[PDB]
Paper text:
Mimivirus is the prototype of the Mimiviridae family of giant dsDNA viruses. Little is known about the organization of the 1.2 Mb genome inside the membrane-limited nucleoid filling the ~0.5 µm icosahedral capsids. Cryo-electron microscopy, cryo-electron tomography, and proteomics revealed that it is encased into a ~30-nm diameter helical protein shell surprisingly composed of two GMC-type oxidoreductases, which also form the glycosylated fibrils decorating the capsid. The genome is arranged in 5- or 6-start left-handed super-helices, with each DNA-strand lining the central channel.
Finally, the 4-Å resolution Cl2 map obtained after 3D refinement corresponds to a 6-start left-handed helix made of a~8-nm-thick proteinaceous external shell, with six dsDNA strands lining the shell interior and leaving a ~12-nm-wide inner channel. Further, some intermediate and relaxed structures were also observed in which the DNA segments appeared detached from the protein shell and sometimes completely absent from the central channel of the broken fibers. Both GMC oxidoreductases (qu_946 and qu_143) can be fitted in the 5- and 6-start maps. In the Cl1a and Cl2 helices, the monomers in each dimer are interacting with two different dsDNA strands.
Author numbering:
A (entry chain A), B (entry chain B): 54 to 702
C (entry chain A): 54 to 351
């Protein structure tokens, strides 16, 4: 009963697309099991303002990500590098996966991030068509309400970019080699050409723009809707309430509220998978040809290990009765970003400061994401690729936001009350984040929301009684995240001083200065950078360098004092992935090593995170997997003018 | 397949006692459920000192209650009173349940709690026999190693109590009505017998002692061992490897790797239970007579909601098929305590302060804490019952530990070194916490670590359009935790200010100061308390009092800033319970209201949180359930000299 | 009752390997009797620091070798050549034999020690594969923390070795003939090639190195474990708590806490062996084809 040539686990960001383009482009019987259910008529999801809690009950006013009925609750172990706290990250449960609860921003990643870090047969020129297909299928829209702050910021970054171009340094964070001598920045003219950060040819690596492309749409009424995988690939036009396909998709048979705990094996090939229905009773599903797993970043290692594939020593220590294959790499090598935050306050006359921040309110067409640029490398960064003098990378993503987005305790401590209406927010984050972790299960019975999740982000360095030059490379490798965070702070400071001069030039007689990071510290950091140079981070370890000069010890105190911001004055970005990268757990065909008929086709099978937000990465993976499993480039050849018909239901 | 006359859910503290004492007096089939595995040869759990991290790997040094392979990770919903933090409370996963991961501390809770806060048939004069049986079964041992600060604290508190009892105040925190106006402090003379806090007749409610009691056990070699509930009642001296007992224990069988799904009903009566093993095969165990669900104060309500007992509307919306009985109050009123930490500094010459703080190291007979007393409510607290003037209660719990117990971020912000010996922690645990919460399920497919659990601790008040005379009771009732915490702060300050002169008299030429809570602020708190008398609490809200005196503004600011510390400079102890309290889901005979033959014997059935640790209360509930289901009072009159026996192998 | 084609006495350093590779590579019924029992979940054994007494009770702080519950107590006669004293030597009792209480160091022996002193059919070229099999099965690991003293010592021995080579004497203690004129000493360079004293071809007879190969391993947690015969050849994957093999090793039936005092004979062939169980009562074991004894040196 309930057989299937291809069995798909989870209707995540790639599961829905895989099921759709697999049922349509073939004639086999396909069955999909998803833990969540459709939310097509849920006002909290469809309305973009539901992210801010416009439909919450009065006595249960919690966020959608913190609701265990919408997402997995992945509580993590205490963090040695984050002052011994236990933050909780979530994965959206339901059709579309984590695209039901995100902030609806799309980035493609770039050209170099796929050209260098990815293995052969996987570069940008092979996934360009899949990326374009995904983007046109989503069909995003830019921001509609334009503000005066954005033009001033654009001209400021333009001035900084032209100064850096005239400088002659090898690489900086406003240098786009593929463009040329002309700075890669948008124009402040009201009739400027809208510059895109997702160009089809990948010519824009680091560049300043005016807006991103939200995953929203405007309806005939005037209401805005949320566009994501669920309402783009698996609407009512294809699957009914009985979970059956119609038309040429009749081979698909999707089952909702179905979580699968284990894949049954015959020793080296899969024969069936079992799930538990809403009755609380178990069920059996028989697999014919292959098994597809789309369980997301944090939870494909668990389903792989619990099913019998993984480190046999630790699995035996846990108590796994049935063992299949032994790799010491299952679940290791996952990556995630981190977003330090800064707050800038404007001082002046009330009218001028009220007019300066015009057109900033949270709107469904932007969700507060005005955005500035995807910045690159710092001039003082020690940890840079060897071939940096040949290509330009992506390291930072500068985005502007209204209000003061900071944890409440830090808001009270710093005094930045949201009642103040003369301040805004800009965020610089790291997309090539260094620190790494691991996931291990604790019980081989059922997939639980809390496995052993060790993630230490900003660790320190303990000097030893060894020669300094012998140990310095180790310290440089270890202290990368703090270096990146402080370089981001310096970049924000340069952008801010350019903002001040440009705003004074543009007729607004106001001044913008940093207040949140205790500007004394930031100004001292800038002075120390200028007076020291490439060896600025040597004083991160005070007794190792042993300068013992008042300037040197004061800089050591400043560096130790400023390390608290990157650790506590931010919130962790939920872009985890790449826990089963190609070569570690799967080959270049996304098939498991040593196994015969199991395939994994989500973000968990990514070699390295992209140079941007990873919405399109998962779907793209699925798209590629569609033609890898079918055997012909059916999906990649389809013309650009073919999008699934969007049904609101 | 299996058959069982009486089924007990959860091999925990009360569950194991229930199972052993039920198979002891009869020969009917008994089945005990437990999903983990054996831990009889694990040094971390067998050795009592392994609780503090004796054998933890250096790379993964975490507490045993923070390890997913040892316990469930029941993260709760954000707390609106502490900047939205989500503390995580754990339930043990193994033989003995939560008795495998605790401190083994034994406290009864006095007699007034069961004199006024428990229903008829649950009074102290009826449960004292069960409490004594539990205490003599555990067989604790008193502390042996002695420091030289306990006598100083006892003498200072003796002076304070003498002054207070001679003052003639109506009620205070150092007066006991069951002994007399003579102060009840342990004599510092070396020829004084100790006054235990667990007297069989409950003579002492507020009592000053020297140490606590702990459920460790002694070996022939000299090594100390842990004899937990699953080790005292379910060890190999009574039950074999396979499960079949011999002789009078032949009616007991324990299952392994069994995690339940739901109890199948036949309309109103329990007919069977089910669970899933490692392989993933469900086994139907039919129940003949009764089902006792005592799987914990966090997951018994969960399995009851899956059973179909709770809110019909919510269960129907979520997707629960079978509805058995509707009870809106199921899993409501969850109760737990709270404890803020503080740091005291010692001043003087290094040698004298070093010898002053000597012999203060954790061992299997102190568990780090020294312990002083358990005081009552203060002289200015407006939150008291009517019976306060006729009988004393147990409101606060004071302990002293070595080192510093304080969050690492708080350590950095306060700038107090952990390596320094001269700082010790003076914590005032509150055992009469005001607020309560409830529990709901998220997804009816499989058991999950994180259900919906709500708990708000520091709910602040906001002015509303109403006269102050008709508003003040609301502010009084809303702000109870803050008043209790600040009065505890004042109690600790008084204790230390007396202990200064007491230590000066004792010989040590030292001075002790209250550093971490900003002694300036605590001194201001004491001065304002003494100045404003019974009307001080009106100043928490500055707009309502309507006094524009600069001293009033200063006092209001001092009250406001001092509220920050209890949110972050504290920790929420894992003594949660009272979710299915007597009179809401169960009645005096523990039969669940609505069903036929179902009973709850966990800690969630407590009618009120006792003034202390909660293992003894749960063991008492299980012991009472033994005789309630047996029908004859065998355990109520069992001789004290008849005790179980333990076997290591 | 309790018959067996091959009867093995004691699960010593060779008994466990013999039982494993005999039950797996044949189809006869094999039964093993061992005086000790498994210590797979004993922190004193698994933890390498248990050798220094990190888990001893306060009132019984004695070494693991001096504990009669872990090893035989072979007290010796007074020594005329050692000033009339009676030192006591021990043999580890249990799975793996004396490998439960040793200091976890592995040496192969060399080429000449087997080439000269051993009889025909037993030289190094006949036992090379067995030695390599044993070494790869144990899979030892070198030292991880390097010290400054070792480099200074290495260069000192290098200077002494080159002086002795230039001397021209017949044989000395830094002269490796199989190497040549270049001294057989490791290099003090931080990026030196790790020289091995257990080379597969036996080219290193006398040579200076940087570390041996401990019988330990590093776990995913970070904890170190003791690697020896018991946890290398007779784990839970092959024998259960009932002492029965599983899979292709089902012919094996091991009995723990079984000491055999005598082998019964029919005049020139063995017919059975008898042991005493933990009850303190005797038992009879019948031998079918041969008897194997692995009771150790003493
Ligand atoms: C607050 C927030 C904001 C974000 N903003 C952005 C943004 O602006 N831009 C961006 O690019 N990304 C953003 N993200 C991240 C983005 O939502 C996802 O990380 C991205 O879709 C990649 O993850 P995924 O979809 O592959 O994982 P998912 O597909 O979401 O992984 C979980 C899925 O697997 C299924 N599943 C898992 N285990 C099982 C099982 N055992 N049985 C059955 N089904 C199972 C679940 O049902 C679910 O469908 C944001 C995330 C969060 C939390
Ligand atoms: C960290 C910590 C410290 C503590 N310290 C103290 C102290 O110092 N003093 C004190 O008096 N008390 C202390 N306690 C409390 C003590 O543990 C009490 O026993 C507790 O309050 C009540 O335990 P219980 O009997 O309800 O446990 P139970 O809930 O009965 O034990 C849990 C059992 O239920 C089983 N189980 C749960 N869910 C399922 C399922 N779905 N399927 C199958 N089996 C299941 C588990 O396997 C386990 O065997 C502490 C508790 C904790 C967590
Ligand atoms: C402190 C110490 C450190 C050491 N360090 C090293 C080192 O670094 N390197 C190294 O190579 N060696 C070392 N050794 C020596 C090594 O442990 C052994 O000598 C080596 O394993 C060779 O002995 P064996 O294993 O064959 O003897 P064993 O096999 O240990 O001999 C005793 C075995 O025979 C069994 N047995 C004996 N009589 C009976 C009987 N009547 N009935 C049943 N069973 C019986 C016992 O149960 C036990 O299994 C060390 C020894 C000690 C004591």
């Amino acid at each position: 009963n309930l057989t299937g040539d291809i069995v798909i686990i989870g209707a995540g960001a790639a599961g829905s697309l895989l099921a759709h383009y697999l049922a349509r482009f073939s004639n086999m019987k396909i069955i999909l099991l998803e833990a969540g259910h459709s939310h097509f008529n849920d006002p909290v999801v469809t309305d973009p303002m539901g992210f801010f809690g416009k439909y919450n009950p009065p006595n249960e006013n919690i966020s959608m990500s913190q609701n265990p009925s919408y997402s997995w609750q992945g509580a993590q172990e205490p963090n040695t590098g984050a002052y011994g706290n236990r933050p909780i990250i979530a994965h959206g449960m339901g059709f579309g996966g984590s695209t039901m609860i995100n902030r609806l921003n799309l980035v493609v990643g770039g050209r170099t991030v796929f050209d260098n870090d990815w293995p052969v047969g996987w570069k940008y020129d092979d996934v360009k068509n899949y990326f374009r297909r995904v983007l046109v299928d989503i069909n995003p829209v830019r921001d509609n309400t334009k503000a005066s702050i954005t033009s001033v910021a654009l001209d400021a970054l333009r001035i900084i970019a032209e100064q850096q171009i005239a400088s002659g340094e090898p690489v900086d964070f406003l240098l786009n080699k593929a463009t040329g001598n002309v700075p890669n920045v948008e124009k402040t003219t009201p009739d400027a050409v809208p510059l895109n950060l997702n160009d089809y040819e990948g010519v824009n690596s680091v560049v300043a723009f005016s807006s991103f492309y939200m995953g929203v749409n405007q309806l005939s009424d005037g209401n805005y809707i949320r566009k994501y995988a669920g309402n783009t690939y698996l609407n009512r036009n294809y699957v009914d309430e009985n979970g059956r396909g119609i038309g040429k998709f009749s081979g698909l048979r999707v089952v909702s509220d179905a979580v699968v705990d284990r894949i049954i094996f015959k020793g080296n090939r899969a024969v069936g998978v079992n799930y538990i229905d809403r009755e609380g009773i178990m069920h059996y599903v028989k697999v014919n040809k292959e098994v597809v797993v789309t369980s997301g970043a944090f939870y494909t290692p668990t389903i792989l290990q619990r099913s019998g594939i993984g480190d046999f020593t630790y699995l035996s220590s846990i108590g796994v009765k049935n063992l299949v294959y032994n790799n010491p790499l299952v679940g290791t090598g996952l990556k995630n970003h981190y977003s330090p935050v800064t707050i800038t306050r404007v001082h002046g006359e009330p009218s001028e400061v009220s007019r300066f921040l015009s057109n900033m309110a949270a709107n469904p067409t932007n969700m507060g994401f005005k955005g500035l640029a995807e910045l690159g490398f710092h001039r003082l960064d020690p940890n840079k690729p060897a071939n940096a003098n040949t290509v330009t990378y992506r390291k930072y993503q500068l985005m502007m936001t209204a209000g003061v987005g900071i944890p409440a305790e830090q808001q009270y401590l710093s005094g930045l009350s949201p009642s103040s209406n003369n301040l805004f927010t800009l965020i610089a984050d790291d997309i090539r984040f260094a620190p790494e972790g691991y996931i291990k299960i604790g019980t081989p019975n059922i997939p639980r929301d809390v496995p052993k999740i060790f993630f230490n982000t900003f660790v320190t360095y303990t000097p030893t009684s060894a020669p300094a030059d012998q140990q310095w490379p180790i310290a440089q490798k270890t202290l990368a995240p703090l270096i990146s965070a402080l370089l981001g702070y310096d970049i924000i400071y340069q952008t801010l001083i350019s903002m001040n001069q440009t705003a004074r030039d543009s007729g607004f007689q106001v001044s913008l200065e940093m207040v949140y990071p205790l500007n004394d510290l930031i100004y001292k950091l800038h002075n120390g950078l200028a007076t020291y140079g490439a060896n600025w981070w040597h004083y991160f370890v005070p007794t190792l360098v042993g300068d013992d000069t008042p300037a040197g010890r004061e800089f050591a105190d400043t560096l130790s004092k400023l390390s608290y911001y990157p650790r506590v004055g931010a919130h962790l970005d939920s872009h985890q992935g790449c826990s089963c990268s190609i070569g570690r757990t799967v080959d270049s065909n996304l098939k498991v090593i040593g196994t015969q008929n199991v395939r994994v086709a989500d973000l968990s099978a990514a070699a390295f995170p992209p140079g941007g937000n990873t919405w399109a990465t998962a779907s793209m993976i699925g798209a590629r997997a569609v033609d890898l499993i079918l055997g012909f480039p059916y999906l990649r050849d389809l013309p650009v003018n073919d999008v699934p018909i969007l049904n609101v239901n």
